[PDB]
């Protein structure tokens, strides 16, 4: 129940980078997933490759003790994996080591205790097969939603860090399929597409906050989770994206203020795929990707460095609820 | 009108939040529901 | 990574591949953030240069590579090149390649990395450390 404000600010920081990268593409990612893969990796990281990472996740190293950050993730993950019987929510962490590779014992015991991480051994010499293992781990974990996480695995790969998050919830107030008509969606000034629009006339936790120049809708799921939607006013999207902070979200989440309204929410099936190296570099995480990296906390056998940082996420929204999955793939190789 | 008619028929932002921890599980921006 | 024997007992390599034989002696002014002075000596159990290589000079590593000018170098890896580094390549091998040996003399060691043939490499000018190297071997 904390370190949360840092995760929230991390979500917005990364979002602004992905948005700057492209303003004409859908965006879907999971902060918790990206954040824990990197947090877990900082465990076997030293000096400044270490600080860049943790500060890159929006942590003030002089205000919160390093041990407490990891205790925060440990508790965060434990809570996420104990949801109300009505909500489905799971996460998993996995270390994929190559045969031999003598790992520092402290690193292994830390990822095990602080991140509840699993650990496997594999021969990266047989690329197609090792790639097969990692991908099945993620596939089984995300219940089939993500099946092709790793498309390319390096032959000299010494170790891989992988995690996944799976979510499935039912709306507290479902929509009626028979009410789903097809309506217009204005992508922009020149393009308009037709999509299945869900409709419901009723009581909603909705309101028009002039601080964000947009309507804000909150839709609870059965259990411990909520979906928040922000509809910016004409020409105000950029304003909304820059005015979002953790404090603001916190405010909406405390009041159940309801009211009558006619709502039109489209069904969705979007996917996000990313190579986070440059976007993360823009957030101050660059050393762990270069020869100036220090992963001597992971192993002493060889001088390792991060080769890839891949993220994938999929979303599905219909009249029953939402279904989502995200995954992270971190590959390390010798300098 | 009354009741207000709120239509998500143009680009919008959204956040998936877990209630106990208050942490952001997922975040996104829909620009074209059919992009593919 | 890979070292390079300059005599029967001493091998000289980069400082970054070590710690984040009998003994190691990293350069006293090694900067792990800028990789400036990225060089070290290892005692166990090619030859040191007499002149600094210049643009155009030959050299090898298998696969020969020319010394690019400082201008090109400085502006291909902006903000990353100190006065003790130079480029060698064109305009793969992969960040952990072998040394630049110009005419039997060890001219350079890999610091930030060996570029790709498919569109340079960045090395430390061994030429600038011969004095510290001989002095260290002579008294150790």
Curated annotation (Swiss-Prot), chain A:
Residues folding into a coiled coil are none
Q: Effect of altering residue 44 to E?
A: In M-Mineral springs; causes reduced AAT secretion
| Residues flagged as site, (Microbial infection) Cleavage | 305-308
Task: PTM S-cysteinyl cysteine: list the residues.
Answer: 209
Instruction: Kindly list the places in or outside the cell where this protein is found, as annotated in its UniProt entry.
Output: Secreted; Endoplasmic reticulum
* A GO molecular-function descriptor: protease binding
Q: Which domain of life is it from?
A: Eukaryota
Alphabetical UniProt keywords:
Acute phase, Blood coagulation, Endoplasmic reticulum, Extracellular matrix, Glycoprotein, Hemostasis, Phosphoprotein, Protease inhibitor, Secreted, Serine protease inhibitor, Signal
GO BP terms? acute-phase response; blood coagulation
Q: Which residues are glycosylated?
A: 23, 60, 224
| Segments for region (RCL) | 321-335
Tissue expression summary: Ubiquitous. Expressed in leukocytes and plasma.
Effect recorded for residue 125 to R: In V and M-Nichinan
Q: Reproduce the UniProt comment on modification after translation.
A: N-glycosylated. Differential glycosylation produces a number of isoforms. N-linked glycan at Asn-60 is alternatively di-antennary, tri-antennary or tetra-antennary. The glycan at Asn-23 is di-antennary with trace amounts of tri-antennary. Glycan at Asn-224 is exclusively di-antennary. Structure of glycans at Asn-23 and Asn-224 is Hex5HexNAc4. The structure of the antennae is Neu5Ac(alpha1-6)Gal(beta1-4)GlcNAc attached to the core structure Man(alpha1-6)[Man(alpha1-3)]Man(beta1-4)GlcNAc(beta1-4)GlcNAc. Some antennae are fucosylated, which forms a Lewis-X determinant. (Microbial infection) Proteolytically processed by Staphylococcus aureus seryl, cysteinyl, and metallo-proteases.
Q: What are the GO cellular component annotations?
A: collagen-containing extracellular matrix; COPII-coated ER to Golgi transport vesicle; endoplasmic reticulum; endoplasmic reticulum lumen; endoplasmic reticulum-Golgi intermediate compartment membrane; extracellular exosome; extracellular region; extracellular space
Further remarks about this protein from its record: The aberrant form is found in the plasma of chronic smokers, and persists after smoking is ceased. It can still be found ten years after smoking has ceased.
Q: Which family does it belong to?
A: Belongs to the serpin family.
Q: What is this protein's function per UniProt?
A: Inhibitor of serine proteases. Its primary target is elastase, but it also has a moderate affinity for plasmin and thrombin. Irreversibly inhibits trypsin, chymotrypsin and plasminogen activator. The aberrant form inhibits insulin-induced NO synthesis in platelets, decreases coagulation time and has proteolytic activity against insulin and plasmin.
- Annotated domain remarks: The reactive center loop (RCL) extends out from the body of the protein and directs binding to the target protease. The protease cleaves the serpin at the reactive site within the RCL, establishing a covalent linkage between the carboxyl group of the serpin reactive site and the serine hydroxyl of the protease. The resulting inactive serpin-protease complex is highly stable.
Q: How does it assemble?
A: Interacts with CELA2A. Interacts with ERGIC3 and LMAN1/ERGIC53. Interacts with PRSS1/trypsin. Interacts with PRSS1/Trypsin. The variants S and Z interact with CANX and PDIA3.
The name on file for this protein is Alpha-1-antitrypsin
Q: Organism source for this protein?
A: Homo sapiens
Curated annotation (Swiss-Prot), chain C:
Is Chloroplast one of the keywords UniProt gives this record? no
Modification(s) after translation: Not sulfated on tyrosine residue(s).
Question: Does the keyword section mention Metal-binding?
Answer: yes
Enzyme superclass (EC)? hydrolase
Name a GO molecular-function annotation.
Answer: metal ion binding
Enzymatic reactions: Preferential cleavage: Arg-|-Xaa, Lys-|-Xaa
Q: Name one GO cellular component term.
A: serine protease inhibitor complex
- Supply the alphabetized keyword list: Calcium, Digestion, Disulfide bond, Hydrolase, Metal-binding, Protease, Secreted, Serine protease, Signal, Zymogen
> What pairs make up the disulfide bonds?
1-17, 52-127, 59-102, 73-87, 92-116
Localization in the cell: Secreted, Extracellular space
Q: What domain of life is recorded for the organism?
A: Eukaryota
GO-annotated biological processes: digestion; proteolysis
Q: What is its EC number?
A: 3.4.21.4
Free-text remark on how the cofactor is bound: Binds 1 Ca(2+) ion per subunit.
Catalytic residues per the record? Answer: 16 (charge relay system), 38 (charge relay system), 96 (charge relay system)
Its quaternary structure? Answer: Interacts with SERPINA1.
Tell me the protein's name: Serine protease 1
> What species is given as this protein's source?
Bos taurus (Bovine)
Q: Whole protein: which stretch is covered?
A: 48 to 246 of 246
């Amino acid at each position: 129940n904390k370190i949360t404000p840092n995760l929230a600010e991390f979500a917005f920081s990364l979002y602004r980078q992905l948005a700057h990268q492209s303003n004409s593409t859908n965006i879907f990612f999971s902060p918790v997933s990206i954040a824990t893969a990197f947090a877990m990796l900082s465990l076997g990281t030293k000096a400044d490759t270490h600080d860049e990472i943790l500060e890159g996740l929006n942590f003030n190293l002089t205000e919160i003790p390093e041990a407490q950050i990891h205790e925060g993730f440990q508790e965060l993950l434990r809570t996420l994996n104990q949801p109300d019987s009505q909500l489905q929510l799971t996460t998993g962490n996995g270390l994929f080591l190559s045969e031999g590779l003598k790992l520092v014992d402290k690193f292994l015991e830390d990822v095990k205790k602080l991140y509840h991480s699993e650990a496997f051994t594999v021969n990266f010499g047989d690329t197609e097969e090792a790639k097969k293992q990692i991908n099945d781990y993620v596939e089984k974990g995300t219940q089939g939603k993500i099946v092709d996480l790793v498309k390319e695995l390096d032959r000299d790969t010494v170790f891989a860090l992988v995690n996944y998050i799976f979510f499935k919830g039912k709306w507290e107030r479902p929509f009626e399929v028979k009410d789903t008509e097809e309506e217009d969606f204005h992508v922009d000034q020149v393009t308009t597409v037709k999509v299945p629009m869900m409709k419901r006339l009723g009581m909603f936790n909705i309101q028009h906050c002039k601080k964000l120049s947009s309507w804000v809708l909150l839709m609870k799921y059965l259990g411990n989770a909520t979906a928040i939607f922000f509809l910016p006013d004409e020409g105000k999207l950029q304003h909304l994206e820059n005015e979002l902070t953790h404090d603001i979200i916190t405010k909406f989440l405390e009041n159940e203020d309801r009211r009558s309204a006619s709502l039109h929410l489209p069904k969705l099936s979007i996917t996000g795929t990313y190579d986070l190296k440059s976007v993360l570099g823009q957030l101050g995480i660059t050393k762990v990707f270069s020869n100036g990296a220090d992963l001597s906390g992971v192993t002493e056998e060889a001088p390792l460095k991060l080769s890839k940082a891949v993220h994938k996420a999929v979303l599905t929204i219909d009249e029953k609820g939402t279904e989502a999955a995200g995954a992270m793939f971190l590959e390390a190789i010798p300098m | 009108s009354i009741p207000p008619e709120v239509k998500f028929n143009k680009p919008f932002v959204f956040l998936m939040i877990e209630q106990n921890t208050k942490s952001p599980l997922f975040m996104g921006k829909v620009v074209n529901p059919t992009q593919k | 990574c890979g070292g390079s024997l300059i005599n029967s007992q001493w091998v000289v390599s980069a400082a970054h591949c070590y710690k984040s034989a009998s003994k190691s002696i990293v350069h006293p002014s090694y900067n792990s953030n800028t990789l400036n002075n990225d060089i070290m000596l290892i005692k166990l159990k090619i030859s040191l240069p007499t002149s600094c290589a210049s643009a155009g000079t030959q050299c090898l590593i298998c696969l020969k590579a020319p010394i690019l000018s400082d201008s090109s170098c400085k502006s291909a890896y902006p903000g990353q090149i100190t006065s003790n580094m130079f480029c060698a390549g064109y305009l793969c091998q992969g960040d952990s390649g072998g040394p630049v040996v110009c005419s039997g003399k060890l001219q350079g060691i890999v610091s930030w990395g060996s570029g790709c043939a498919q569109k340079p490499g960045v090395y430390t000018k061994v030429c600038n450390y011969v004095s510290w190297i001989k002095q260290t071997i002579a008294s150790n």
